[PDB]
Ligand SMILES: CNC(=O)c1cccc2cc[nH]c12
């Protein structure tokens with residue numbers, strides 16, 4: 062589990078969004094596994110605006126923050142999960158590291174801020190849904 066809190070937006074894994082998130086929906090893309098909802102209170106997080114390929118991610122299933130190299134966001138074939146059938150996931154970044162389904166929402170950060178959240182995993186890879194292309198998160 063986990064979320065990004067930037068301005069009056071909450072960024073969550075689409076598959077973990079709550080009734081409240083859907084009632085207060087701003088934007089969602091099933092192909093990216095992202096949903097953004099509106100918040101009353103201001104968040105503290107800064108989104109990275111960069112093409113960094115090194116960062117650190119939180120892995121709840123290890124209670125550990127791991128430094129990783131990761132690929133640039135791309136379209137990747139993702140095997141079926143409990144929430145999605147096997148399909149191509151867009152804006153996805155891969156790193157060699159430990160992920161379990163419950164690790165989704167773990168933040169990947171670089172020197173510039175939040176890069177994305179854990180979305181996919183298994184086979185010793187972790188997949189992060191990029192948010193850095195979502196420029197509108199920084200305003201309104
Ligand atoms: C929607 N798919 C998931 O819940 C998922 C997310 C992160 C890691 C793994 C490993 C297998 N499935 C995973």
Ligand SMILES: [Zn+2]
Nearest residue numbers: 111113171173
């Ligand atoms: Zn960066």
